[PDB]
Design a binder for this molecule. Structure first.
Ligand code: CLA
Ligand code: CLA
Ligand code: CLA
Ligand code: CLA
Ligand code: CLA
Ligand code: CLA
Ligand SMILES: C=Cc1c(C)c2cc3nc(c4c5[nH]c(cc6nc(cc1[nH]2)C(C)=C6CC)c(C)c5C(=O)[C@@H]4C(=O)OC)[C@@H](CCC(=O)OC/C=C(\C)CCC[C@H](C)CCC[C@H](C)CCCC(C)C)[C@@H]3C
Ligand SMILES: CC(C)=CCC/C(C)=C\CC/C(C)=C\CC/C(C)=C\CC/C(C)=C\CC/C(C)=C\CC/C(C)=C\CC/C(C)=C\CC/C(C)=C\CC1=CC(=O)C(C)=C(C)C1=O
Ligand SMILES: CC1=C(/C=C/C(C)=C/C=C/C(C)=C/C=C/C=C(C)/C=C/C=C(C)/C=C/C2=C(C)CCCC2(C)C)C(C)(C)CCC1
Ligand SMILES: CC1=C(/C=C/C(C)=C/C=C/C(C)=C/C=C/C=C(C)/C=C/C=C(C)/C=C/C2=C(C)CCCC2(C)C)C(C)(C)CCC1
Ligand code: OEC
Ligand SMILES: [Fe+3]
Lengths: 31, 421, 33, 38, 137, 339, 76, 333
């Protein structure tokens, strides 16, 4: 269990990747 | 102050420069050879002073007896002088060609020496310089077979200068070295054991150089070659630039792990030599204290002196187990089928072998900037730094930066073709 | 132009001691034992 | 496992021919944004 | 606190006569030690045979005795196992083995004496250290 | 008579001497001379046992200004200090320099952040720089004051030298296993992150510079009206986005974030040290130690390291700490086989 | 500084005689031996009192001065 | 015909990344490393680093916490040889002799190398200069130095550099106890490069932040950005160049933006350039300085220089590094 917790917080840091890189807010020049 | 970049297109000045720096390279050849035969003392391990070229000169077995420093002093003075004067012969040339006047408008000249972007002329100039290496290479061959030999460290007794006969000219053997794993002891070019391979390995180059020099002379590059490569002046540097880098590495690693080419007798002992040398030194020591080497059991259960290699042979134990690939003239006679013969060991071990072990083991390539010899912790009363560590060290450095150069100049050829100029 | 705190002092405050030391140090290098 | 060693080499060289033949490529060659010389 | 005569007033032979060295010599001792020794005898400790040192006390227990100069000189010319039963000239530097230890070829009687002196004066200066490397170990 | 001085003093010359100019220069000068003086002329073996200066022949690296003797605690022994009794020469023999340098030098740091505030209200700029500067000042007090305070005395504070600092490092590794502290880890994060930024930012710019801005094609020009500046955010963006995957493109954030990383880090690190001041460390993993003793066939890098430490401590503490007078018999010393 | 006195001759003139006057003034600071006595940085003659294998330490907070002297009288 | 349609894909924008000829190797490579590596850290069995039969296990399942460690170096027996999977027998074996190490390393370097190439190639498809290729070259080169050159210079990947947090520390410690780095200019410039970058990345961003366009839609309740379309850019460089110049002196400050940002990419990169060399130079035994003795010829009494107490610590550690794996008196590698 000391384990799953180091894993759990791991899967999130990769889940955050995907979601940050593929679901980010657009950088547009519409301005 | 990109001064040297303003010269790019006025080939009339580059000749002035290329032949100016070409004058330094030779200058150093004399300034150092003479500086060495200067400080140089006879009968003291070449390498325990701090020399580099002489060792090269004795490599070619120019002046030596069975692993005996030098019987004839002179051979080095010749080299020291020649190159020191070739430095003026060219200093004159470089300077002149640099200052007296540019090129490309001499009609009969442009017929003998052309310019860039002209694949057929660049090609032609290239082949030329290829006909020159084809020769220098083959000259080395001459100096081993019909001339004052070359230094063979192998069989037998002392391996003084020996002349070679019928070099390994087999078509297979030569490129086999190219097709072999560059790992664990086996580095393609480094694996070179027999000195005869080395001679024959040079004969084929020259034939290949020459057969090539002429080839481009007569032929301009095909389509595929034209659409892959660019043709700017800067870009040809990027090609040549990165080529040299690889080699810096090449030779460096080539330096650390000796092939007869770098007889450890001048250069010193190999990083592994020292370790393996330390194992052997102690078998004897205890053997003299009546210790039985086969039944030894080190705190690990691996036997202090003898253990195996994954493929199952015998090798000196201890961290020096990682250098069982090591081979030299002293450790070999104990070698036999299945690894080291426990029977030649305790029975047939000559004394002159303990000497070499002790000497090498004693002059471990290990050193610091203060030239302090041995472990990082020793006292400053011993000066030494194996030439190899010097060559390996400095030369690594250049092979690196130089690569940084392959990136910088080749990435700038992408800015000429259309990018930023 | 004149002599002034800034230009003047700054420079000699730092720059003068230095040569006194460089002088002292230069003397050291030859000492024995 | 000898079956494995083989499989690998195929894979590896496979993607090598894609690097090599991707550059010598008569088709894409050295096409940039500012100038195409063909 | 300077280098003194007493300091250099070292034993010359087994019986009881002594010689007092000089400044000039002492220094040549080091220079020579470092030249054909240090490498194997750094700081006065055998690298090839750690269980045997060059400390003064251990030299007296040799065969023949070696706490004095004449003994060392003899050793440098011809070697003697700690007990004196084997001829280790084919293994250890010796004026008799110049042909194999080229560093020895040049050496002279005066130099042996000085080298010997260096080895006997050191311990009075360094103390425990020169032994098994205290500061050094 | 006041405002005048304000101006004369705050007069815009070559070297700006403001109101703070009075603290800064007298202190930042003496703190420099103090170093350079002893560095070149004083010995600290009456107080530390080693060689301090060039006078005895140390190399630049070796030479330093050593800390007072542990027998003195935290007594600021100033020249008129009951202990030195006004005798300069001895005031130096005893190390009365360290205190000198740290104190004057502490105020020079005070002056330098003050001078950073002045200049911002004369020019009318933001105070931010003055704030970024707190990190170092933290690190400084943390190190040279807080730490020595918590411990036995002034002696244990870093020594003013090169090597004398490396020895500090190592000291920490052995008795504190500072590397395991998480705080030093974050500190280690920002410093390496500061350099990572410094490269990508500086390289991106330089390399995304506007094409043809110079016919000659070298890049040594600008002007005030060059409002747009020499490079593209739009291209960088896509560059990164497609190579690294992320790229917040809003110049104002990029630079501020460049304040956060380095500075945010050193504050931690400094915190981490206020901790060690009280021998309160992150030198152990109960969980492991426990299973480390009930079982001998189990080992991790955590362990292998704790072994090196004891080696550092046993061998290095008797020469490194002269006052307790440690006598350690050969046998006693921890020691791996054959070495 | 765009080179201001850096070019004139007066700058060289007033220093050509000034700087080599400190360069020397300093050198004599070491050859004469004021350093040692002004700073109290023992010389190779005075580290260990021949056959005094101990390192002078300091123990009492108030006797630093009388302690140090106790060490200088010894060496003499 | 098809062959042409494939290349076009690889070559331009794909709404996620750019995967050119360089990422044709980089993508499958770095994947094998990631996967292998993640799993090795969560379950790898113990591995005996130095040939000795004393396995070390730095994996999650086998009793570790994150800092405690990870993927351990190949055996010292296979040390310098090529250790693939096919080349061995059962994976129970492989797992013991450090296989994961080599496998992960080599793929990573190669793909690490290509990640660099990829950086340049994107430049060629976007007409911009080729510099970023160069600044990455610093750490990359360094990784290689630590993960390759050394084990290549030393004689075995074992003691390359563990893939754990903890072992990183070990590698460091053992390292300076064996080669004494602290006192080596290349690691000194290294600290210069890094402490450099820190001081500069704070300086720049600090100033750039202080000299902003004080009057652009920024009030005390909101703070919203700029976008390329914004001409004058964010700050008044005259205010910054004026600020810094007044803090020390005119020269001290930077006139234009090129010298500013060029400096930012020059200091760090050329600092690590050297350090990465530092290691590579001590990979073949050209260890740092070592001023072990300064004397008082008076009697020859040895005087300890601050550096000796450095050798006193370097000492304790030498003695106990790789406890019980030494059979002979002096380590020679
Ligand atoms: C094959 C050889 C080679 C050649 C012919 C060139 C040629 C050129 N280079 Mg390239 N370069 C090379 C290798 C080469 N380079 C390598 C290996 C690298 C990677 C480090 C570079 C990196 C490089 C850069 C980064 C730049 C160039 C530039 C240029 C142009 C420069 C003109 C100039 O201003 O020089 C001026 C040169 C100098 C002031 C030399 C500085 C050398 C160092 C500091 C000396 C170190 C010595 C040290 C003191 C010794 C200590 C003693 C020792 C015993 C310990 C010129 C076309 C410039 C350009 O714009 O290209 C078009 C440019 O910006 N080059
Ligand atoms: C590798 C070495 C090297 C070389 C070969 C060159 C070569 C050259 N440089 Mg470059 N340069 C270099 C390094 C080098 N540079 C570096 C490191 C920098 C940065 C500091 C520069 C910066 C630079 C600038 C800024 C400029 C050049 C220019 C030039 C060209 C000048 C031609 C001339 O007639 O000058 C005039 C010649 C002289 C003043 C004479 C020098 C005489 C020598 C020392 C004599 C030596 C004695 C001789 C061997 C005696 C022979 C006797 C006989 C009996 C044997 C030339 C091709 C210039 C240019 O525009 O080129 C296109 C230019 O403006 N360079
Ligand atoms: C890298 C290797 C290298 C290379 C490739 C070259 C290549 C070359 N060299 Mg160089 N050289 C080198 C190294 C090298 N050199 C070195 C190391 C040195 C120093 C030893 C020299 C010294 C050198 C000299 C001294 C000369 C050359 C010349 C030449 C060119 C000769 C071509 C020819 O057909 O000449 C055949 C010669 C001729 C057709 C001569 C015609 C004579 C002229 C037109 C007379 C003008 C006088 C007229 C009466 C004036 C009327 C004026 C009115 C007011 C009265 C050629 C480009 C020659 C050159 O550049 O001159 C053309 C030359 O004179 N080289
Ligand atoms: C001096 C060096 C040299 C250089 C720079 C060149 C350069 C070139 N050659 Mg030439 N060549 C050389 C020597 C050289 N050659 C020699 C010595 C020979 C005789 C065998 C030839 C025979 C030759 C032929 C027959 C052809 C060329 C062609 C070409 C062009 C090919 C385009 C290309 O690179 O495609 C891409 C390149 C590759 C796929 C090859 C990569 C090879 C690696 C880097 C080197 C491997 C070297 C080897 C293993 C080392 C020897 C080890 C030793 C121990 C035995 C190019 C301009 C072509 C041409 O110009 O067409 C008209 C062509 O058809 N060359
Ligand atoms: C003097 C001869 C010599 C030379 C030149 C080399 C050279 C090299 N050695 Mg070897 N070595 C030698 C002797 C030698 N060694 C000996 C005697 C031993 C006995 C112990 C070793 C043991 C040894 C080990 C243990 C290792 C090396 C490694 C390396 C490489 C390091 C650079 C790199 O990262 O390349 C990266 C690759 C390139 C720059 C590719 C160049 C080839 C063409 C131009 C590109 C192909 C592109 C494509 C993307 C890649 C396909 C590669 C394929 C393997 C899948 C370098 C090629 C390291 C390595 O990475 O192994 C190969 C390594 O770990 N060597
Ligand atoms: C508080 C005071 C202090 C000071 C003054 C120093 C100073 C130094 N340390 Mg130490 N250090 C300290 C505390 C201190 N340290 C502490 C508390 C620790 C933790 C125990 C360390 C740990 C430490 C380590 C581990 C190392 C150092 C090293 C160094 C040297 C680094 C050189 C460097 O590049 O720095 C970074 C700074 C810069 C690159 C820039 C400084 C600014 C310069 C002077 C400006 C030059 C500009 C010029 C005047 C104007 C040009 C104008 C332009 C427009 C053209 C330096 C001598 C390193 C070394 O090499 O040791 C010898 C090293 O490895 N230090
Ligand atoms: C190697 C470490 C390091 C050094 C040497 C260093 C140095 C410096 N940083 C400055 C500034 C800054 N540094 C900053 C952030 C950072 N600086 C960092 C790391 C360093 N910064 C880091 C990691 C950061 C990120 C937080 C900022 C944000 C600024 C500034 O604004 C300022 C500047 O203007 O930039 C250039 C300059 C301040 C001058 C001053 O205030 O004098 C006053 C005080 C003096 C002279 C002495 C006080 C007394 C101290 C105790 C004595 C030091 C004496 C030494 C021991 C003796 C010499 C030793 C030799 C080995 C060198 C100074 C050159
Ligand atoms: C003239 C001349 C030749 C002088 C020589 C000087 C000299 C030899 C000094 C040697 C040793 C030394 C440091 C002595 C210190 C004495 C003392 C008390 C000094 C103060 C020193 C000091 C604070 C120096 C800083 C030097 C310096 C200007 C470094 C560059 C920092 C840097 C790159 C900042 C980033 C930056 C700068 C800008 O300017 C603008 C605008 C923006 C935005 C920006 O980010
Ligand atoms: C920097 C520069 C440059 C360059 C330069 C160069 C490249 C140079 C070179 C030079 C050279 C390349 C030189 C050479 C020289 C030489 C000499 C000067 C020699 C001499 C000699 C002698 C004198 C002799 C010896 C001897 C002998 C043989 C015998 C025994 C004895 C004796 C020892 C006497 C240029 C111009 C481009 C431009 C500008 C810059
Ligand atoms: C103590 C005191 C005092 C005084 C003093 C002072 C303040 C001083 C200062 C001093 C100083 C201030 C000094 C200095 C010295 C210096 C020196 C001796 C230097 C040198 C340098 C060099 C040699 C350099 C070089 C270089 C090079 C070559 C290159 C790279 C870089 C460099 C720059 C590093 C008083 C009375 C107030 C009171 C209290 C106490
Ligand atoms: Mn990993 O290590 Ca290069 O030092 Mn000696 O040999 Mn093995 O012991 Mn440590
Ligand atoms: Fe910026």
């Amino acid at each position: 269990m000391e384990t799953i917790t180091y894993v759990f917080i791991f899967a999130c840091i990769i889940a955050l990747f995907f979601f940050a890189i593929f679901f980010r807010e657009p950088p547009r020049i519409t301005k | 102050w990109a001064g040297n970049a303003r010269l790019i297109n006025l080939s009339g000045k580059l000749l002035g420069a290329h032949v100016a720096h070409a004058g330094l390279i030779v200058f150093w050849a004399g300034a150092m050879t003479l500086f060495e035969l200067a400080h140089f003392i006879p009968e003291k391990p070449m390498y325990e002073q701090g020399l580099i070229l002489i060792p090269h000169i004795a490599t070619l077995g120019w002046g030596v007896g069975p692993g005996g420093e030098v019987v004839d002093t002179f051979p080095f003075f010749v080299v020291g002088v020649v190159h020191l004067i070739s430095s003026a012969v060219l200093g004159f040339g470089g300077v002149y060609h640099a200052i007296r006047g540019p090129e490309t408008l001499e009609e009969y000249s442009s017929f003998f020496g052309y310019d860039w972007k002209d694949k057929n002329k660049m090609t032609t100039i290239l082949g030329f310089h290829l006909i020159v290496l084809g020769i220098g290479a083959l000259l080395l061959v001459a100096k081993a077979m019909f001339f004052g030999g070359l230094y063979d460290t192998w069989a037998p007794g002392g391996g003084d200068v020996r002349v070679i006969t019928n070099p390994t000219l087999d078509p297979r053997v030569i490129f086999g070295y190219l097709l072999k794993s560059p790992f664990g002891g086996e580095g393609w070019i480094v694996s070179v054991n027999n000195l005869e391979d080395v001679v024959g390995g040079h004969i084929w180059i020259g034939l290949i150089c020459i057969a090539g020099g002429i080839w481009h002379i007569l032929t301009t590059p095909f389509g595929w070659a034209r659409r892959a490569f660019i043709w700017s002046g800067e870009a040809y540097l990027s090609y040549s630039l990165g080529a040299l880098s690889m080699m810096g590495f090449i030779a460096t690693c080539f330096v650390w792990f000796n092939n007869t080419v770098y007889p450890s007798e001048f250069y010193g002992p190999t990083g592994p030599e020292a370790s393996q040398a330390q194992a052997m030194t102690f078998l004897i020591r205890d053997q003299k204290l009546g210790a039985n080497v086969g039944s030894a059991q080190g705190p690990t259960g691996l036997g202090k002196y003898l253990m195996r290699s994954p493929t199952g042979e015998i090798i000196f134990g201890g961290e020096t187990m990682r250098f069982w690939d090591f081979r030299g003239p002293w450790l070999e006679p104990l070698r036999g089928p299945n690894g080291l013969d426990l029977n030649k060991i305790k029975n047939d071990i000559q004394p002159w072998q303990e000497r070499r072990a002790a000497e090498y083991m004693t002059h471990a390539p290990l050193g610091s900037l203060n030239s302090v010899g041995g472990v990082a912790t020793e006292i400053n009363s011993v000066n030494f730094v194996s030439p190899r560590s010097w060559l390996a060290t400095s030369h690594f450095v250049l092979a690196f930066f130089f690569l940084v150069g392959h990136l910088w100049h080749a990435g700038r050829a992408r800015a000429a073709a259309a990018g930023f100029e | 132009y004149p002599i002034f705190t800034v230009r003047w002092v700054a420079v000699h405050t730092l720059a003068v001691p230095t040569i006194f030391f460089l002088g002292a140090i230069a003397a050291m290098q030859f000492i024995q034992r | 496992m000898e079956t494995l060693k083989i499989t690998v080499y195929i894979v590896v060289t496979f993607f090598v021919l894609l690097f090599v033949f991707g550059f010598l490529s008569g088709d894409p060659a050295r096409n940039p944004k500012r100038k195409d010389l063909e | 606190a300077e280098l003194t005569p007493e300091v250099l007033t070292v034993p010359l032979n087994s019986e009881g006569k002594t010689i007092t060295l000089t400044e000039k010599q002492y220094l040549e001792g080091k220079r020579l030690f470092q030249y054909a020794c240090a490498s194997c005898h750094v700081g006065g400790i055998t690298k090839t045979n750690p269980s045997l040192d060059l400390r003064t006390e251990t030299l007296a227990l040799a065969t023949p005795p070696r706490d004095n100069i004449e003994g060392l000189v003899d050793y440098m010319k011809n070697p003697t196992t700690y007990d004196g039963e084997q001829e280790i000239a084919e293994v250890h530097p010796s004026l008799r083995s110049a042909d194999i230890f080229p560093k020895m070829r040049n050496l002279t009687e005066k130099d042996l004496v000085a080298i010997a002196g260096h080895i006997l004066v050191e311990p009075k200066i360094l103390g425990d250290k020169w032994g098994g490397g205290k500061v050094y170990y | 008579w006041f405002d005048i001085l304000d101006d004369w003093l705050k007069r815009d010359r070559f070297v700006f001497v403001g109101w703070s100019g009075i603290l800064l220069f007298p202190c930042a000068y003496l703190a420099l001379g103090g170093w350079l003086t002893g560095t070149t002329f004083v010995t600290s073996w009456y107080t530390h046992g080693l060689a301090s200066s060039y006078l005895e022949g140390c190399n630049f690296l070796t030479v330093a200004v050593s800390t007072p003797a542990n027998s003195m605690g935290h007594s600021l022994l100033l020249l008129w200090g009951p202990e030195a009794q006004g005798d300069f020469t001895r005031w130096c023999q005893l190390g009365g320099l360290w205190t000198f340098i740290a104190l004057h030098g502490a105020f020079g740091l005070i002056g330098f952040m003050l001078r950073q505030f002045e200049i911002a209200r004369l020019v009318g700029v933001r105070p931010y720089n003055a704030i970024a500067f707190s990190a170092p000042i933290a690190v400084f007090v943390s190190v040279f004051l807080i730490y020595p305070l918590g411990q036995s005395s002034w002696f244990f504070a870093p020594s003013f030298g090169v090597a004398a600092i490396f020895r500090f490092l190592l000291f920490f590794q052995g008795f504190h296993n500072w590397t395991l502290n998480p705080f030093h880890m974050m500190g280690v994060a920002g410093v390496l992150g500061g350099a990572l930024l410094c490269a990508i930012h500086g390289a991106t710019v330089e390399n995304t510079l506007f094409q043809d801005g110079e016919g000659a094609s070298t890049f040594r020009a600008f002007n005030p009206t060059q409002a747009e500046e020499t490079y593209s955010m739009v291209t960088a963006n896509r560059f990164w986005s497609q190579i690294f995957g992320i790229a917040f493109s809003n110049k104002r954030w990029l630079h501020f974030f460049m304040l956060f990383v380095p500075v945010t880090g050193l504050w931690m690190s400094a915190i981490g040290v206020v901790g060690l001041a009280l021998n309160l460390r992150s030198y152990d993993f109960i969980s492991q130690e426990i299973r480390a003793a009930e079982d001998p066939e189990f080992e991790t890098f955590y362990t292998k390291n704790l072994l090196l430490n004891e080696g550092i401590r046993a061998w290095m503490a008797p020469q490194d700490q002269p006052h307790e007078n440690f006598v350690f018999p050969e046998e006693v010393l921890p020691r791996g086989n054959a070495l | 500084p765009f080179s201001d006195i850096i070019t004139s001759v007066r700058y060289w003139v007033i220093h050509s005689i000034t700087i080599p006057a400190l360069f020397i003034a300093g050198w004599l600071f070491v050859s004469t031996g004021l350093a040692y006595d002004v700073f109290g940085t023992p010389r190779p003659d005075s580290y260990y009192a021949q056959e005094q294998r101990s390192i002078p330490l300091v123990t009492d907070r108030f006797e630093a001065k009388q302690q140090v002297e106790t060490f200088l009288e010894q060496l003499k | 015909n098809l062959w042409e349609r494939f290349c076009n894909w690889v070559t331009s924008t794909d709404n996620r990344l750019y995967v050119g000829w360089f990422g044709v190797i980089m993508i499958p490579t770095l994947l094998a490393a990631t996967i292998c590596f993640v799993i090795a850290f969560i379950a790898a069995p113990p591995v005996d680093i130095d040939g000795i039969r004393e396995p070390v296990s730095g994996s999650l399942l086998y009793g570790n916490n994150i800092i405690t460690g990870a993927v351990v170096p190949s055996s010292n027996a296979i040390g310098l040889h090529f250790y693939p999977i096919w080349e061995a027998a059962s994976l129970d074996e492989w797992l013991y002799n450090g296989g994961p190490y080599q496998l992960i390393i080599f793929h990573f370097l190669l793909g690490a190398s290509c990640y660099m190439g990829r950086q340049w190639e994107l430049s060629y498809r976007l007409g911009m200069r080729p510099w970023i290729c160069v600044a990455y070259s610093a750490p990359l080169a360094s990784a290689f130095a630590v993960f390759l050159i050394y084990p290549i210079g030393q004689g075995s990947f074992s003691d390359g550099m563990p893939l754990g947090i903890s072992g990183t520390f070990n590698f460091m410690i053992v390292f300076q106890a064996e080669h004494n780095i602290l006192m080596h200019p290349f690691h000194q410039l290294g600290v210069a490069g890094v402490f450099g970058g820190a001081l500069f990345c704070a300086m720049h961003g600090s100033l750039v932040t202080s000299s902003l366009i004080r009057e652009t839609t920024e009030t005390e309740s909101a703070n919203y950005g700029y976008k390329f379309g914004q001409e004058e850019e964010t700050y008044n460089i005259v205010a910054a160049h004026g600020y810094f110049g007044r803090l020390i002196f005119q020269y001290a400050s930077f006139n234009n933006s090129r010298s500013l940002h060029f400096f930012l990419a020059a200091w760090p990169v050329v600092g690590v350039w050297f350090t990465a060399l530092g290691i590579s130079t001590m990979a073949f035994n050209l260890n740092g300085f070592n001023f072990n003795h300064s004397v008082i010829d008076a009697k020859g009494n040895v005087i300890n220089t601050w550096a000796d107490i450095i050798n006193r610590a370097n000492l304790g550690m030498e003695v106990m590094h790789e406890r019980n794996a030494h059979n002979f008196p002096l380590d020679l590698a």
